[PDB]
Amino acid sequence: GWKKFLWDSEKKEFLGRTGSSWFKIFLFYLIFYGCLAGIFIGTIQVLLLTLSDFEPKYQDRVAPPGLSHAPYAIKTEISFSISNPKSYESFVKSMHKLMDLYNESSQAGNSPFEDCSDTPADYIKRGDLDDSQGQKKACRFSRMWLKNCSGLDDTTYGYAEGKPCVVAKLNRIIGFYPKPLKNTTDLPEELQANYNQYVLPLRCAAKREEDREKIGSIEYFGLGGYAGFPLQYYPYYGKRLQKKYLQPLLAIQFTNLTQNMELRIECKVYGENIDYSEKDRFRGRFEVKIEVKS
Amino acid sequence: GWKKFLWDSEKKEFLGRTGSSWFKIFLFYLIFYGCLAGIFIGTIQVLLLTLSDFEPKYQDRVAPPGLSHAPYAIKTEISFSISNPKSYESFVKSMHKLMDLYNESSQAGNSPFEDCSDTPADYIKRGDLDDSQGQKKACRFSRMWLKNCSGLDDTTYGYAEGKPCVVAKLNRIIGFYPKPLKNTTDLPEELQANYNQYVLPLRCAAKREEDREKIGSIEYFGLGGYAGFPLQYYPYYGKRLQKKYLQPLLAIQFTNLTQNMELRIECKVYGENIDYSEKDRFRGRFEVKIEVKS
Amino acid sequence: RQLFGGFSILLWIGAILCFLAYGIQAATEDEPANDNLYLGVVLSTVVIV
Amino acid sequence: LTSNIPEITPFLVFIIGNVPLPLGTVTILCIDLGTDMVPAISLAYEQAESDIMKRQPRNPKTDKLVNERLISMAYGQIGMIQALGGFFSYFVILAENGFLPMDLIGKRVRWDDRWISDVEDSFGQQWTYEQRKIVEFTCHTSFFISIVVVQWADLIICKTRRNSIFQQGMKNKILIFGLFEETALAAFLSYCPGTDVALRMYPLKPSWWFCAFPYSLIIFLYDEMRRFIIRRSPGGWVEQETYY
Amino acid sequence: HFIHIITGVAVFLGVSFFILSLILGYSWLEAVIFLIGIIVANVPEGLLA
Amino acid sequence: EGPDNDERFTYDYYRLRVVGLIVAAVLCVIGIIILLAGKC
Amino acid sequence: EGPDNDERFTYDYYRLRVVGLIVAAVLCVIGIIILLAGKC
Numbered sequence A, B: 001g002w003k004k005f006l007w008d009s010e011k012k013e014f015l016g017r018t019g020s021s022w023f024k025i026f027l028f029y030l031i032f033y034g035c036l037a038g039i040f041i042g043t044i045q046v047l048l049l050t051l052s053d054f055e056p057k058y059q060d061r062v063a064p065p066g067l068s069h070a071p072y073a074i075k076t077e078i079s080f081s082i083s084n085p086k087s088y089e090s091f092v093k094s095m096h097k098l099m100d101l102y103n104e105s106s107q108a109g110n111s112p113f114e115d116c117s118d119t120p121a122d123y124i125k126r127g128d129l130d131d132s133q134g135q136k137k138a139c140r141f142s143r144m145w146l147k148n149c150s151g152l153d154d155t156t157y158g159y160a161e162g163k164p165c166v167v168a169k170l171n172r173i174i175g176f177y178p179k180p181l182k183n184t185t186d187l188p189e190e191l192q193a194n195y196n197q198y199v200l201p202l203r204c205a206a207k208r209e210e211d212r213e214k215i216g217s218i219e220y221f222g223l224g225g226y227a228g229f230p231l232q233y234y235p236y237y238g239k240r241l242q243k244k245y246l247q248p249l250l251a252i253q254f255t256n257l258t259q260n261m262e263l264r265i266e267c268k269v270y271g272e273n274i275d276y277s278e279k280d281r282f283r284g285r286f287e288v289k290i291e292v293k294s
Numbered sequence C: 001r002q003l004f005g006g007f008s009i010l011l012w013i014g015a016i017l018c019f020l021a022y023g024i025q026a027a028t029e030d031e032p033a034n035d036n037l038y039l040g041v042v043l044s045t046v047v048i049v
Numbered sequence D: 001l002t003s004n005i006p007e008i009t010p011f012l013v014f015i016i017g018n019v020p021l022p023l024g025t026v027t028i029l030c031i032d033l034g035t036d037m038v039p040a041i042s043l044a045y046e047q048a049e050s051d052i053m054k055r056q057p058r059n060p061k062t063d064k065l066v067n068e069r070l071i072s073m074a075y076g077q078i079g080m081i082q083a084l085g086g087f088f089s090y091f092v093i094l095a096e097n098g099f100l101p102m103d104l105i106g107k108r109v110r111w112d113d114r115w116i117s118d119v120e121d122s123f124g125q126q127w128t129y130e131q132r133k134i135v136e137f138t139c140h141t142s143f144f145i146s147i148v149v150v151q152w153a154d155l156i157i158c159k160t161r162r163n164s165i166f167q168q169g170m171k172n173k174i175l176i177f178g179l180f181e182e183t184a185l186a187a188f189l190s191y192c193p194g195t196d197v198a199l200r201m202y203p204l205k206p207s208w209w210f211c212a213f214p215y216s217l218i219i220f221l222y223d224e225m226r227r228f229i230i231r232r233s234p235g236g237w238v239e240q241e242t243y244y
Numbered sequence E: 001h002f003i004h005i006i007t008g009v010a011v012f013l014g015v016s017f018f019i020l021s022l023i024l025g026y027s028w029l030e031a032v033i034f035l036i037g038i039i040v041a042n043v044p045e046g047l048l049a
Numbered sequence F, G: 001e002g003p004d005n006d007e008r009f010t011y012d013y014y015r016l017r018v019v020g021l022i023v024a025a026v027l028c029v030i031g032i033i034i035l036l037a038g039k040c
């Protein structure tokens, strides 16, 4: 048993058979798995063919666009002490990582960046979704536009003295045209003043009615001084057709924030092709928990 | 045109293209015709698998059996002069070719030939259609049984003095059991006498009523002296299972044949699983035109 | 022996764990999710069937 | 025993290759209860192949029920094929929604992070957390259907081990019932309005149902030939190796 | 008897997947979670019934 | 293809569900008919 | 398989012709229906 089944020397067997059998079974399995691999690779190549390089075949899942933010907060909470410097480092590292892509050195020369209206404007169409007129051109977005949250004056961006900033950003979607609400009698209260048609408004508030009083002055920084996104940076043509493309950003400073207390702040964008979802808490709006404990 | 289209030396072109193109097209056609050949060979191998080696899948076309004869007459006519020897050579060569397979030297030893009843007998079953009991055994058929047409005494077989012979033969069919007509009140006139159940009767006559008188004495030679085929040589098991198998034969001497006149003689076999066809003049019966012009 | 044998025991655990996952959620987080409650309601039905 | 391979391979590539999970918990439970309960029971009721009395008796010492050949056919040959069949539907769903195959190796670490709402796909778009989880669930449902589709073939080939199905015939009614019923279960769970909230299955588009068809025909044709060679050559290599 | 052999193969593979996990950097806890899951997925269920 | 290209972001899931349910019901009926044909 | 194995040499060509004709007529009808649907 023990020995005879492992190796016998009369029939010249290992594990139960001689050798020729092992050679035939091994050869068969090698050829079989080779045919299987080849067929799988061919059926996957036909699929790599079917699709187009400039446009995803289905765009119903990423619509409408979301609303992400920097810093990178886990559980949507921004808690840091004004004394211990090693408390807001994970936040500043992220904020810096995001703003580090808008350096003027990167946006240099005529290509592939072109100058655009310093004031909000309308859409700009650079053609169809082809390779005919080569790489398209994207509008420049300067860092300095964000006034007190730019990392150029106060690298920390505010976390140093109990005045934090939040750089909001709209999710990039190919061929998506933002449509703001019109001046008709039906419009939220907030949006009435400064109705620049060319700007998509973003406005933050308090989740609960009580927290209203505990929240101070929400100071929005953006293109032209408005609290929104200029329509001129749309639409987006995709990575392949618009490499080196920069999406607008909006800075939000939560000045006069009550100390030692968790505040729930909900920011929300408004527009026609903008819709929220009770399941996805990042579709169009976003929630942040701020607690400047010092 | 004439020269430029054949060979130009600036673009290095032959018949219209350079070379790389010829290499790509030739390579493509080679690979393509290789895939085609391989697929055809595989689809033909599956077919070579499907069938059995001991039995044709369909046996409805060769049924019932025919009735062939030696000599080999073209247009079913046997015309030869009794004086010129170079007139019946093509016939004797054939007759000899057929009888040359029944030489006793070939049927020698215990295998694979066994002795059978010298008188007609019943069927003999050597088992099923398998390879279990190896090569089956077939009954011996001696040349001498044919008395005056054997090529052993008068090599010519009769054509030398205006008395020809005709060796009739039943077409070999696998698993075919010959069934003769029973003794009931309904039976042809001829068959009544010598009703050996074990013998399949063969009887020749004249196609037209007039020719009757011009035809002489039809002398049949066979196993046991009867004008038929003994049932003991059936059934036939096929080449693969019964190599070195000999089928019965029946000699017919047309003695007393009128000289210098075309005679139409029709020979016919009788039996249950025997049926004639108005389209096939060799199914069960056969026609011969004899004219011994001298 | 049928509902509480040897292989079904592990499934009984899966169900327990998931229910605790929903309790800590509803007690803590405002407006929770429900993938855990339905996961437990499905697992329990599997052991029973 | 054949369905074991497609349920384990996803958890293997997921951990090793670091790709999004192809099969989950709810979908796996659906596979076990759907394609393995009724079709299996139907097999018991099968009729006898002609050959039953035309074959030698058995020596219990030399011939056992579970030998080294059953695992060869189920795990090794048939199984790996059902696994490839499900992987194709998975790759197709992702490629069409924007995520290609080359970019998928390593996205798990980032994929499973509820906090990165900015996930970027191949075409450069930015995806949130539930927007990408929805596509992953559409892959779970497709995998499930690809499994039922390949099961069709596995079940058909299981009726006979020496004769063909053209010889044996489709006179078993319970087996047919199983084929129609399973197909119905998959279509119902994928299209019903509310399974999304409760079971986490999403509707499947029409061009996807067919992804598993080539792998379903290959299994049937392979077994048919595998048998022809057996019938023609007794005591050959095929009978020594694959006849269970 | 068969079930026994398979169980042996399964327990072995569990410990193996464990070394692969720790040589790849997971958490001591994740390796035991994998061992438990793999051994549960390799043993067949239903045969005797 | 112009600002009002909203169709590129819409899908008729309703019709798909309706057809899928019709098919499911039909297949299930066929199954019952075959399983019970004859009362045995 | 015994002397009375005549079945091995018989084929039911009659039934085959009947079915082939039924099919031919059906296919031809389908064709006419499709070609003339609408009177144009």
Ligand SMILES: C=C(/C=C\C[C@@H](O)[C@@H](O)[C@H](O)C/C=C/C=C\[C@@H](O)C[C@@H]1O[C@H](C[C@@H](O)[C@H](O)C[C@H]2O[C@H]([C@H](O)[C@H](O)CC[C@H](O)/C=C/[C@H](C)[C@@H](O)C[C@]3(O)O[C@H](C[C@@H](O)CCCCCCC[C@@]45C[C@@H](C)C[C@@](C)(O4)[C@@H](C[C@@H](C)CCCCC[C@@H](O)[C@H](O)[C@H](O)[C@@H](O)[C@H](O)[C@H]4O[C@H](C[C@H](O)[C@H](O)/C(C)=C/[C@H](O)C[C@@H](C)[C@H](O)C(=O)N/C=C/C(=O)NCCCO)[C@H](O)[C@@H](O)[C@@H]4O)O5)[C@H](O)[C@@H](O)[C@H]3O)C[C@@H](O)[C@@H]2O)[C@@H](O)[C@H](O)[C@H]1O)CC[C@H](O)[C@@H](O)[C@H](O)[C@H](C)C[C@H]1O[C@H](/C=C\[C@@H](O)[C@H](O)C[C@@H]2C[C@@H]3C[C@H](O2)[C@@H](CC[C@H]2O[C@H](CN)C[C@H]2O)O3)[C@@H](O)[C@H](O)[C@H]1O
Residues within 6 Å of the ligand: C013, C014, C017, C018, C020, C021, C022, C024, D004, D007, D008, D011, D021, D023, D024, D025, D028, D032, E022, E023, E024, E025, E026, E027, E028, E029, E030, E033, E034, E036, E037, E038, E040, E041, E042, E043, E044, E045
């Ligand atoms: C029900 C099950 C059980 C659980 C189910 C579970 O899922 C769920 O129910 C959940 O529980 C739900 C429950 C919820 C409960 C409550 C919640 O509701 C409520 C909420 O929960 C939330 C949490 C929740 O949100 C969570 O997230 C859930 C997840 O949890 C898991 C997480 O991941 C993870 O736990 C996160 C938690 C946390 O992280 C834990 C950390 C650790 C505890 C600990 O570290 C922390 C900490 O330190 O612990 C301290 C306590 C200490 O006393 C402990 C002592 C430690 C002992 C140390 C010894 C280690 C050891 C051990 C030895 C044996 C070997 C050895 C080698 O290592 C040896 C060596 C020594 C020498 C090492 C010494 C190290 C020293 C360490 C210690 O000292 C301590 O660390 C130290 O003291 C510390 O204090 C100190 O700080 C130290 O820090 C550092 C230490 C390091 O960190 C650490 O050491 C590290 C890194 C080690 C690294 O390994 C090192 C490596 C790099 C390596 O060395 C390396 O370099 N390699 C380099 C290689 C290299 O270069 N190579 C180069 C190559 C060159 O060639 C530092 O270094 C040190 O120095 C320092 O000292 O010794 C102390 O407390 C603290 O300190 C603490 O911090 C994960 C899950 O559990 C769960 O999802 C809460 O946040 C929330 O607040 C609460 O409200 C069964 C599971 C199922 O069966 C299974 O299916 C399972 O579900 C799947 C598997 C899931 C997977 O798939 C899922 C998707 C689908 C699945 O479901 C599918 O189903 C899968 C299926 C499975 C199978 C197969 C197939 O697929 C299917 C087929 C089945 C089919 O077939 C069937 C047929 N039968 C039919 C059909 O079914 O079934 C996925 O979704 C899953 O994600 C996925 O996982």
Ligand SMILES: CCCCCCCC/C=C\CCCCCCCC(=O)OC[C@H](COP(=O)(O)OCC[N+](C)(C)C)OC(=O)CCCCCCC/C=C\CCCCCCCC
Residues within 6 Å of the ligand: B050, D164, D166, D167, D217, D221, D224, D225, D228
């Ligand atoms: C929407 C979903 C549709 C799904 C469609 C699925 C179609 C089927 C897929 C492939 C079919 C081809 C498989 C052929 C494999 C070889 C089978 C074989 O070799 O069987 C051998 C048997 C002979 O047995 P025996 O003589 O020993 O029996 C003796 C019986 N005793 C003992 C009573 C005398 O032969 C027989 O039974 C005769 C049976 C002949 C059947 C021929 C079928 C082939 C015709 C077309 C195939 C398709 C080609 C490509 C199609 C792509 C489609 C888009």
Ligand SMILES: CCCCCCCC/C=C\CCCCCCCC(=O)OC[C@H](COP(=O)(O)OCC[N+](C)(C)C)OC(=O)CCCCCCC/C=C\CCCCCCCC
Residues within 6 Å of the ligand: D152, D153, D156, D165, D166, D167, D168, D169, D170, D171, D176, D179, D180, D183, D213, D216, D217, D220, F027
């Ligand atoms: C687009 C491409 C897709 C390719 C995917 C491949 C899928 C799987 C591939 C092939 C599987 C299907 C093969 C069907 C085989 C039919 C064979 C057949 O026809 O053999 C004729 C039999 C023989 O008759 P006999 O009297 O000579 O037998 C005498 C028996 N003795 C001797 C014991 C008395 O006749 C009988 O069995 C009686 C009549 C039975 C008629 C059965 C019809 C139902 C067949 C399948 C049902 C569909 C299941 C799928 C459900 C999903 C739908 C949504």
Ligand SMILES: CCCCCCCC/C=C\CCCCCCCC(=O)OC[C@H](COP(=O)(O)OCC[N+](C)(C)C)OC(=O)CCCCCCC/C=C\CCCCCCCC
Residues within 6 Å of the ligand: C042, C045, D030, D033, D034, D185, D192, D193, D194, D195, D197, D198, D199
């Ligand atoms: C054979 C075993 C194999 C498989 C076994 C699986 C075991 C699973 C056992 C139980 C699972 C129970 C699943 C419960 C079904 C859903 C219940 C539920 O929790 O629903 C919640 C939803 C509410 O969602 P929401 O408000 O967030 O939507 C917002 C939509 N927005 C925002 C886009 C507009 O309710 C709605 O949507 C309303 C829709 C209600 C759905 C009615 C469907 C009826 C469900 C089952 C009956 C079918 C039995 C089969 C009978 C066969 C007869 C031959």
Ligand SMILES: CCCCCCCC/C=C\CCCCCCCC(=O)OC[C@H](COP(=O)(O)OCC[N+](C)(C)C)OC(=O)CCCCCCC/C=C\CCCCCCCC
Residues within 6 Å of the ligand: B039, B042, B043, B045, B046, D214, D217, D218, D221, D222, D225, D226, D229, D233, D235, D236, D237
């Ligand atoms: C999406 C695609 C759908 C369709 C895919 C179809 C794939 C299936 C095609 C073939 C099935 C592969 C089966 C593998 C079995 C081969 C094993 C073999 O090698 O067994 C050889 C045996 C020898 O047995 P022995 O006893 O003498 O061994 C004595 C050994 N000693 C001497 C050591 C004792 O048999 C012989 O040599 C003679 C018998 C040779 C049989 C060749 C059968 C070829 C049939 C089909 C292939 C063609 C398909 C064309 C389709 C084109 C697709 C693009």
Ligand SMILES: CCCCCCCC/C=C\CCCCCCCC(=O)OC[C@H](COP(=O)(O)OCC[N+](C)(C)C)OC(=O)CCCCCCC/C=C\CCCCCCCC
Residues within 6 Å of the ligand: D184, D188, D192, D193, F013, F014, F017, F018, F021, F022, F024, F025, F028, F029, F032
């Ligand atoms: C023995 C065999 C007997 C068989 C007899 C069958 C008789 C025929 C009965 C039904 C035939 C089909 C009925 C068609 C109506 C289906 C209802 C439907 O099309 O609903 C669709 C909408 C869902 O909303 P949405 O797509 O806009 O969501 C957004 C989608 N997103 C999230 C992807 C964006 O529904 C809604 O809103 C409201 C939904 C209200 C509740 C619908 C109930 C559906 C559940 C079960 C009924 C089907 C039973 C089939 C039985 C098969 C046997 C296995």
Ligand SMILES: CCCCCCCC/C=C\CCCCCCCC(=O)OC[C@H](COP(=O)(O)OCC[N+](C)(C)C)OC(=O)CCCCCCC/C=C\CCCCCCCC
Residues within 6 Å of the ligand: G013, G014, G017, G018, G021, G022, G024, G025, G028, G029, G032
């Ligand atoms: C606008 C579209 C309008 C379409 C309306 C169609 C209405 C339906 C009309 C006919 C439907 C099918 C009728 C079935 C009867 C067929 C007759 C039949 O089964 O005969 C078989 C026997 C043949 O003898 P056997 O097999 O024993 O020979 C021995 C065979 N061996 C040599 C191989 C051994 O017949 C005999 O003996 C006696 C034969 C007597 C004459 C039969 C006439 C058949 C010729 C034409 C009729 C079919 C027209 C179909 C129109 C299609 C449109 C393109």
Ligand SMILES: CC(C)CCC[C@@H](C)[C@H]1CC[C@H]2[C@@H]3CC=C4C[C@@H](O)CC[C@]4(C)[C@H]3CC[C@]12C
Residues within 6 Å of the ligand: A034, A035, A036, A038, A039, A041, A042, A043, A045
């Ligand atoms: C056993 C048989 C049926 C397997 C046949 C496998 C065929 C489909 C496989 C074998 C090798 C494969 C090729 C390998 C490499 C490339 C280069 C790539 O840039 C395009 C696809 C292409 C050209 C593959 C196409 C599919 C292919 C030809």
Ligand SMILES: CC(C)CCC[C@@H](C)[C@H]1CC[C@H]2[C@@H]3CC=C4C[C@@H](O)CC[C@]4(C)[C@H]3CC[C@]12C
Residues within 6 Å of the ligand: B034, B035, B036, B038, B039, B041, B042, B043, B045
């Ligand atoms: C391009 C692809 C699809 C062509 C594949 C061709 C396949 C079907 C061909 C290529 C070579 C062929 C083999 C060549 C030689 C033999 C030996 C013979 O005694 C049995 C058939 C067998 C084993 C053939 C089977 C069919 C075969 C394997």
Ligand SMILES: CC(C)CCC[C@@H](C)[C@H]1CC[C@H]2[C@@H]3CC=C4C[C@@H](O)CC[C@]4(C)[C@H]3CC[C@]12C
Residues within 6 Å of the ligand: D152, D183, D187, D205, D206, D209, D210, F015, F016, F017, F019, F020, F023
């Ligand atoms: C195996 C053979 C005999 C039958 C094969 C049946 C296949 C082709 C059937 C089974 C279930 C069917 C699906 C059932 C439901 C739907 C949803 C509908 O909105 C589009 C068609 C689609 C996707 C069907 C396509 C055809 C389908 C996949």
Ligand SMILES: CC(C)CCC[C@@H](C)[C@H]1CC[C@H]2[C@@H]3CC=C4C[C@@H](O)CC[C@]4(C)[C@H]3CC[C@]12C
Residues within 6 Å of the ligand: G015, G016, G017, G019, G020, G023
């Ligand atoms: C191409 C697709 C869409 C349809 C394919 C139709 C094929 C399968 C149809 C066309 C004509 C049909 C044949 C018409 C007549 C007969 C004679 C009958 O006694 C046996 C069946 C048989 C031999 C049919 C078999 C099926 C057949 C070959």
Ligand code: NA
Residues within 6 Å of the ligand: D001, D003, D004, D032, D036
């Ligand atoms: Na299983």
Ligand code: NA
Residues within 6 Å of the ligand: D032, D036, E045, E046
């Ligand atoms: Na199981």
